[PDB]
């Protein structure tokens, strides 16, 4: 199942813990272009989910999602008291870790898969000089834009294709984050595209941070991430737009979504309205918007499945340099248990191929259609 | 830890000792007692014997029965359940389920889980006459307790102006659980003066337009909806109004946390399917969108405002009427057994001699979650 070599590296840093992992599928061997690696599908003490192991040194730790606060002022007071913290952009994208492994630059998704799309086009997004000088470091960033393989939308100021946004630089094996100041100096030196840095703030400037959130909401942007200078304390606060747009997109599918998906966003909206003491007409605008994004996409999908045999679907586009990359993506999508096929192809004026993928949602379609056709259930 | 006497009754019903023992081990069957009478309660279902079944002796087995399945699409729900055959349409009443039976020389009232309800048992003779059990000791009256002064619900049907009322919806045989045909049940309710759910009439798929009109009237009257039953009571489905769904959200949003899994999602789904079936669009649709957002956010934001000031917990106040003060204290004890945090907040005597008890239920887990979030606690999704 798993080589004794990988099990051995795991011993460094129970043999039955390894074995239960091996048996349950918590650790699995994988391979990319001949390079074999171990992927941690489940977290094992210090080693988080998404950790990948190629050898003793090439260990790329997974890292978790950033904790959210739903109440900005008290969230800051709890996390930072009155000490300063950096405020950076939260970007609506998917997480990647970029590392040099052997002579190759590989890009890993959150779960620890080598992403064939982002890996092939990595030199379009970043320069490789960084890894010549820092081969033991991992660039952690968001891939975001309107032509994404994993998200239907993204930041509004990315007008085409997709872009990388650095938000952390971590050491291999330890996972240690560089202090903010050092990471920002490295990004400037090596021309690594970065999340926007809004500045250094503290609890006393909460009014300025509320004003920033209001601007970001109007600009249809995701929100902010707050970081101690030493990167040891990090919390995220997202805009009302992020929560409402999330519901709008998810309501098309509705069923078979993550547990609490809509609840979590309703809660973040309520706490924003409570904290900011929004009332009257402004409050009514938000209530109207929440009702529309829960119901309109959902009802439109019901009309879709009521009038034919086609499945609920999402269309998305990406750009690739080689057609073979599109077929490698289809294979990778299938491994992720996603039902995606190539729906359309065009060649761009710059020589890139624009691939239109279509993802269908068979389980949500089936549950929706059964309910439309009168299936009866208890709550 | 279940007696051999009770275990044997189950065996006599064909149940296996390995199932019985596995049930004993998980807690699927537990012994309970009311006023000295010991019985077995099925907290989990055992093959033929559903959850909430209670066993006092060989004859006094009162089967539990599940919630009635809902359809979210009325026309296709009818076609699937009944095809074009006729079915009775009765009111769904927003209340709590009870089973009323004669056990020995006592009339006992059971809630859905198989607990004897101290409140409803004490006041049963206010709601129904006991003549029925003199003639039919082997039958179980199944109904809803509903009204503005309920121990378990904060609201109820708008035409019940005070106190609480019983609404018969089924008559079942002991041990077998067999439901009497609709026509037989209605004849018995008339003969014995048993208060009943409203029967709107006999309908079929071809009359779908009249049923949509009925739902429209019931929504404007702030009523729960309809229950559709084959004459033989073997096929039963329920369809609730937009009001039932919107009001459920409004009430629940005050608490928000620690509610049943999918509570709000289930109701958003029922509104969407109603809007789709009825092809509501434009301004009419916007009115429902405005209403859904208001009932999700306004009660929730109001509770956040509440917990942001002071140390008081999210609470609901409700009243009941009792004949004896001792019944109120038995209710507090019973509420605690159910893991509910309820105390007596106020008491008054009515001009007719009843005691009106005001209970206060507090929600400590929902309060704590909401307060921690207000105070900046950080979590992943
Ligand atoms: Mg897109
Ligand atoms: Mg988003
Ligand atoms: Mg999102
Ligand atoms: Mg009440
Ligand atoms: Mg209800
Ligand atoms: Mg209700
Ligand atoms: Mg208060
Ligand atoms: Na269609």
The CATH number of whichever domain residue B289 belongs to comes to 1.20.58.2250
Contact A363, A330 (CB under 8 A): no
**Structural domain containing residue A44:** 4-56
For A232, the token pair is 């040891």
Domain identity same for A16 and A139? no
- Of residues A66, A296, A373, nearest to B76 (C-beta): A373
Task: Return the half-sphere exposure (C-beta side, CA atoms, 13 A cut-off) of residue A78.
Answer: 20
**Chain B residue closest to A377 (CA)?**
B69
Distance CA B170, CA A328 (A): 61
If asked whether residues A325 and A196 sit together in one domain, one would say no
| Residue A187: C-alpha distances to residues A105, A126, A129, A168, A183 (Å) | 18, 10, 11, 10, 6
Which helix (H) or strand (E) segment is A250 a member of? helix A240-250
CA separation (Å) from B177 to A80, A197, A222, B139?
62, 69, 57, 9
- CATH number for the domain harbouring residue B164: 3.30.470.30
The helix or strand, by DSSP H or E, that contains position B305, with its residue range, turns out to be helix B282-308
Judge whether A12 and A30 are in contact, CB under 8 Å: no
B139 & B17 share domain: no
Of B68, B70, B271, the CB nearest to A295: B271
The answer to whether residues B153 and B169 belong to one domain is: yes
Distance CA B196, CA B183 (A): 13
Q: Are residues A213 and A184 in the same domain?
A: yes
Would you say the C-alpha torsion B259, B265, B270, B272 has a positive or negative sign?
positive
Q: Would the CA dihedral through B335, B340, B341, B344 be positive or negative?
A: negative
CA A377 from centroid of its chain's CA atoms: 35
Is A81 in the same domain as A229? yes
By C-alpha distance, the chain B residue nearest A295 is B272
- Using the beta-carbon criterion (under 8 Å), do B374 and A263 form an inter-chain contact? no
Q: Which residues pair with A356 in a beta bridge?
A: A317, A344
Q: How far is the CA of A92 from the centre of ligand 2 (A)?
A: 5
Which two structure tokens, joined as six digits, stand for B24?
């004993």
Say if B94 falls within a structural domain: yes
Which residue, among A299, A370, A377, would best test binding to B if mutated, counting the most B CBs under 10 Å from its CB?
Answer: A299
The label of the residue with tokens 């007696």 reads B3
Cβ pair A67:B379 closer than 8 A: yes
Q: Are B226 and B92 in contact (CB under 8 A)?
A: yes
Same-domain check for residues B319 and B337:
yes
Q: Check whether residue A92 and residue A224 sit in a common domain.
A: yes
Q: Which residue in the set A264, A289, A375 is minimally distant from B381, CB to CB?
A: A264
CA distance B5 to A364: 49
Neighbour-count burial of A139, counting CB atoms closer than 10 A to its CB (0-12 exposed, 13-18 middle, 19+ buried): buried
End-to-end Cα distance, chain B: 41
Asked if the structure places residue A52 within a domain, the reply is: yes
Are the C-beta atoms of A149 and A318 separated by less than 8 Å? Answer: yes
**Strands annotated E in chain B:** 29-34, 37-42, 54-55, 61-62, 87-92, 96-103, 106-110, 139-146, 165-173, 199-203, 225-229, 236-240, 315-322, 341-349, 355-362
Task: Give distance in angstroms: CA of A74 to centre of ligand 7.
Answer: 17
Looking at the fold, whether A50 and A130 belong to one and the same domain comes out as no
In a domain, A207, yes or no: yes
| Residue at B371 is within a domain | no
Spell out which residues of chain B touch residue A258, defining contact as CB-CB under 8 Å: 381
A79 and A206 together in one domain: yes
The answer to the question of residue B222 being in a domain is yes
- Residue B122: how many CB atoms within 10 A of its CB? 17
DSSP letter, residue B218: H
Same domain, A224 and A82: yes
Q: Which residue has tokens 């970065």?
A: A194
Rounded to whole angstroms, what are the CA distances from B51 to A210, B10, B41, B94, B108?
52, 14, 8, 21, 18
Exposed e or buried b for every residue in B27-56, given b needs 16+ CB within 10 A?
A: ebbbeeebeeeebbbbbeebeebebbbbbb
Tokens linked to A77: 């007071």
Helix (H, G, I), strand (E, B) or coil at A369: helix
Cβ atoms of A78 and A92 within 8 Å: the answer is no
User: Of B79, B293, B381, which is closest to A374 when you measure between CB atoms?
Assistant: B79
Number of domains in chain A: 3
Asked whether residue A141 is domain-assigned, the answer is yes
How far apart are alpha carbons A329 and A114 in whole angstroms?
Answer: 11
Q: Chain B partners of A377 at a C-beta cutoff of 8 Å?
A: 69-70
What is the whole-number distance in angstroms between the Cα of residue A368 and the centre of ligand 8?
Answer: 13
CATH number for A26: 3.10.450.740
Cα(A302)–Cα(B124) distance, integer angstroms: 46
Ligand 7 centroid to A263 CA: how many Å? 24
Say whether B364 sits in a helix, a strand or coil.
helix
Ligand with smallest separation from the Cα of A369: 8
Tokens 């100096």 correspond to: A185
Q: How far apart are CA B298 and CA B302, in angstroms?
A: 6
| Structural domain contains residue B336 | yes
Distance, CA of B370 to CA of A253 (rounded, Å): 29
Distance A145 CA to ligand 2 centre (A): 12
Q: A368 CA distance to ligand 1 centroid (A)?
A: 25
What count of residues does chain A have?
379
CB of A70 closer than 8 Å to CB of A267: yes
The closest of A112, A110, A107, A101 to A125, measured between CA atoms, is A107
List CB contacts (< 8 A) between B75 and chain A: 374
**Token pair of B318, please?**
């409700």
Q: Could you tell me where the DSSP H helices lie in B195-262?
A: 208-220, 242-253
Residue B231 lies in a domain: yes
For residues A96 and A34, state if they share a domain: no
């Amino acid at each position: 199942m798993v080589s004794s070599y990988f099990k051995g590296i795991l011993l460094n840093l129970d043999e039955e813990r390894i074995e239960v992992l091996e048996n349950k599928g918590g650790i699995v061997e994988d391979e990319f272009e001949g390079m074999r690696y171990l992927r941690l599908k489940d977290s094992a003490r210090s080693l988080r989910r998404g950790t990948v192991v190629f050898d003793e040194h090439n260990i790329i730790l997974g890292f978790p999602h950033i904790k959210r606060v739903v109440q900005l002022e008290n969230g800051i007071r709890r996390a930072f008291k009155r000490k300063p913290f950096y405020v950076e952009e939260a970007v609506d994208g998917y997480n990647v870790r970029v590392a040099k492994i052997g002579e190759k630059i590989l890009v890993f998704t959150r779960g620890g898969f080598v992403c064939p799309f982002t890996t092939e086009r990595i030199e379009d997004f970043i320069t490789l000089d960084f890894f010549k000088d820092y081969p033991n470091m991992v660039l952690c960033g968001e891939m975001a834009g309107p032509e994404s393989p994993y998200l239907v939308e993204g930041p509004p100021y990315v007008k085409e294709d997709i872009q990388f946004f650095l938000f952390d630089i971590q050491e291999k094996k330890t996972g240690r984050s560089l202090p903010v100041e050092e990471r920002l100096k490295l990004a400037e030196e090596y021309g690594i595209p970065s999340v926007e840095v809004f500045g250094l703030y503290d609890l006393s400037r909460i009014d300025e941070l509320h004003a920033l959130i209001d601007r970001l909401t109007k600009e249809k942007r995701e929100g902010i991430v707050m970081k101690s200078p030493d990167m040891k304390k990090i919390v995220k606060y997202v805009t009302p737009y992020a929560n409402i747009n999330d519901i709008k997109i998810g309501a098309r599918i509705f069923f078979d979504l993550p547990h609490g998906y809509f609840m979590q966003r309703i809660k973040r909206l309520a706490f924003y309205l409570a904290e900011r003491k929004i009332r009257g007409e402004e409050f009514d605008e938000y209530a109207r918007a929440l009702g529309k994004v829960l119901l309109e996409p959902f009802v439109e999908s019901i009309w879709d499945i009521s009038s034919g045999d086609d499945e609920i679907a999402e269309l998305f586009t990406v750009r690739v340099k080689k057609l073979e990359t599109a077929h490698k993506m289809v294979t990778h999508f299938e491994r992720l248990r996603l039902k995606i096929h190539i729906d359309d192809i065009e060649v761009l004026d710059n020589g890139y191929w624009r691939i239109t993928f279509k993802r269908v949602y068979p389980d949500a379609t089936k549950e929706m259609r059964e309910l439309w056709n009168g299936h009866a259930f208890v709550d």
